Symmetry: D2
Subunit: 316 residues, 4 copies
């Protein structure tokens, strides 16, 4: 089969090429966005492979189908940029990667948390230019503090495993407690208790109507002064405006956000400069092993479709 | 008593002041180094408090004694900068902080490791200026890799507890294996096995004659290509010249060093990260250092026995 | 007419839009490179507007022609990426911008030079994080030193006007000396005198066979220790390998290079030397981007009306 | 003689050492501030050498005299930190460096201006990590624009010579028109005309009562949108609060400030969010200008030691 890959970054290319050694697809890599105008560049391909900024609205899907495309493979878990009803009407198959390597994501969240804690991002800015002053870099010992994890799916549990290794007291919130978390000694609590008791908070939950702007003024109001917050889940779990205010106020001691590529809204520049704030550009799954799993699943998804096999990751 | 504090940083001042609420010493804070020339500034103080760059050689200690100083308190574990024989001969007491909060230090080492792994230091340099490109930032999943910890004192064990939590296989080397490590499932091995098997290596051992330049060309020779190395122990455990060559060579994938408080105190070219002896720099760990320091001095003042007395 | 613009940056778009207020073309902006695969995106346009990385080799031009494109407008002076013989054979017109605003380019070069001299790039890295240490930032007073300019076209003369304002002794080398330079008090000299007498050197000349690798080991050998070199002209005027060696050697005190897109063949010498790269930024001013857009749209307007276009390459 | 140097930075040490090769003083370098508590460190020296943050109030001078000091040398032009009456009463001599190389200062101002114009400081941040994007880096061609220089002393004239070289239309304000400026073609105007006509404005004037907060809300109000402003003179010529507000509302396009050691975050936010550049009192920081300062300083002290007359004696 022939596959056109849109929004291609060098790391996308590297792992798709590597994995394709087991599949033998003809791969065509485009660095630009799939849009209604660029969809004609998929001519001669049975499949396209897209990511979060690509446009999968109806007019694009119509243009793909006119050019003979049959299959759309999201190299990601999110699918809000694809009109699935239109895809279904047009006869197009849509597949996705059901979830990222949960350990890669959790380990990114701990990496953000420790970089923020010990100001290692600031330290490097100093030491790369041979300034070894430690003023302002003082952090906190994690051992013995309380961590709150919101969401105990596979990612959140991977996070809790790590936090346990740091010797922290483990609190969680989730509507549905997970057995794996309870073996780690995690105490499920309600959100108000999690807010009020947690030295560090990390979000590992899907965005739903119920938890949209879950971290808002009232939430921050209840947190400890100097609380550390990391969000590697969707940006909308947090009310930006309330966060900035709580930063200025000094309720939030540190904030780390892995900012999704279609959620970016110089708030970034100011907050990064003036506060212990760290943005990363949707980097939580960016490891060799996790990018390999994404590629594997993507090309295995397409292989299924081509052979008429059942594809567990089919959205339509 | 009155205490002159040399080489004072704002964080030193903050925790000494906080802790001094339990002691009531009169504190005099100087931001400059103790040297033979500045020793005279301590006149009227019974005690000085110094750190790793302050000069405690004989001629400085002679000056301190002439100006009435009786006690020297190192707000640190190392004491290489103080001439203990000269101190003893002059009748000066020297006290120190026996060890740092081992969790603070291990936590810094894991911080360095994850910062290097995920290139978060490089990410921030982009994103503070709203560049969200991820090119060049790819890391590795730690889960299921092998970590090698060299030295299993309290710090090394603290490190192993954290590495366990990441789901890593745990190897260690130490002449004298520790019971606490064994409970974590650590497998003690010899240095060659540690080098060859480890995805990440972290040093948590004192500098001795025998392990001076422990990580040299022959060591790097045996390591995996792309190995990650973090050194929060003394810089001399590593042969700099061999490290640089193994970096250029691409044997070493990433190198983090918490460079001693003046041990020559690069970052441009490779995945290399220096921090300026920052491994004990947390509120809790600085509080313990100040507590112990002022308690050490309180002991001396009252003639009590001081477990942290060097002389 | 309808114009498809490839490799579009925001600044490209801004000035094309502004200028197009006088022309009324229908503009279609693409942020991606023109290649054989993307050429089909130009279908419905009589013209494409490209820059230095876009592919104008024969296969791409064949595809443009099949999609009804007649005109190719380079928003730049270089045309190395376009197969002009193939264009001519296929009947496609190629137009370009003959030169950039010479003052924009000279002014960039002096900017590089003073940024390097006073280490203002390094100062900002410190002061943006409230570090006001000045260690390592010491420069030199320009007044009374000697500047050497290689190439006295419009850009080099613009540069010499500026350097005159700094109160420098002005030397220049060009195979055709310019009368315009003499007013400024410039002394034309041979290369060996320029190399040996100059505290700062700046290149402002086209790349020719004669001056390919003009700054090589033998050149550096003759220069003062600590010499400052700025190159806003083509990268091949300099033998890279000899420059790096002369940097490590400490013959060259500072090096600035405005590195062209297709000459991009950084971290270590940026790190460990007073070296500064900019990304082919010398024409990046509002006025100069305006001129490029004016000329581009005027070039296309000529072609559409059958008028003679002075900037036609074929 | 033996000389104790306070507030010593690396470059102070380098040039004093260099220049001292022809004087042979015994030099003692201290990196810390002279205060009443550290004055005792000068014991055994006949002279101290101080800079702008060192404390020369009476209680310090009393302590210096008690320790055998006779001479105080300021390696700078300002002497606000020294009590000259008390020095005179105690019998201490005070010398200074009468002015800095005006070209070094003007050149730093132009360096600031062009760095800001072409965003070269932002460029370098990108390119040192191989990012060659030019988005946001667009500047303006200087040729044919209008420059306003406020103050036409030696520094200001040095600046006008450079700006003439850029082919700019030259406006100035100064109570006293300078001949040297007029021969450059400068048109003297009043401040309101300068503000309204100038694309770039550079301050080169001493701080006086009448020009304290000279650049305030009313000034900014009258300037062109996107104006570029550079201040290598004293910080108080500008009303910081009004400048920030004019930055946010986008009246000021770029702002450069060379920030004095005794006049220092607002720094971080503005540096991040706007085309703002601070330098740390770097305007005299060249080899030539630091050499002159050290020469004059050691020559001042040599004069004193030999009883000669010292043109730079304050006391
Ligand atoms: Mg010498």
């Amino acid at each position: 089969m022939k596959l056109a890959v849109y929004s291609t970054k060098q790391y996308d290319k590297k792992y798709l090429q590597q994995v394709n050694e087991s599949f033998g697809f003809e791969l065509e890599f485009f660095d630009f966005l799939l849009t209604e105008k660029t969809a004609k560049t998929a001519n001669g391909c049975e499949a396209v492979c897209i990511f979060v900024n690509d446009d999968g609205s109806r007019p694009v899907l119509e243009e793909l189908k006119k050019h003979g495309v049959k299959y759309i493979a999201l190299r990601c878990a999110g699918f809000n940029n694809v009109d699935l009803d239109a895809a279904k009407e047009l006869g197009l198959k849509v597949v996705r990667v059901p979830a990222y390597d949960p350990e890669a994501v959790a380990e990114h969240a701990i990496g953000m948390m420790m970089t923020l804690n010990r100001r290692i991002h600031r330290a490097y800015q100093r030491t790369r230019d041979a300034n070894f002053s430690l003023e302002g870099l003082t952090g906190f010992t994690m051992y013995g503090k309380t961590a709150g994890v919101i969401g105990t799916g596979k990612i959140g549990v991977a996070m809790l495993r790590i936090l346990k290794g740091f010797g922290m007291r483990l609190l969680a919130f989730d509507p549905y407690p997970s057995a794996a978390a309870l073996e780690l000694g995690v105490e499920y609590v309600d959100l108000p208790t999690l807010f009020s008791e947690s030295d560090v908070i990390s979000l590992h939950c899907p965005l739903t109507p119920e938890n949209y702007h879950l971290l808002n003024e009232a939430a921050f109001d209840q947190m400890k002064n100097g609380v550390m917050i990391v969000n590697t889940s969707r940006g909308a779990l947090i009310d930006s405006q309330a966060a900035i205010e709580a930063l200025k106020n000094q309720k939030i001691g540190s904030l780390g956000m892995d900012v999704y590529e279609n959620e970016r809204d110089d708030v970034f520049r100011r907050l990064s400069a003036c506060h212990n704030v760290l943005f990363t550009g949707h980097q939580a799954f960016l490891t060799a092993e996790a990018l390999t799993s994404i590629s594997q699943t993507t090309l295995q998804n397409l292989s299924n479709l081509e052979k008429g096999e059942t594809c567990p990751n089919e959205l339509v």
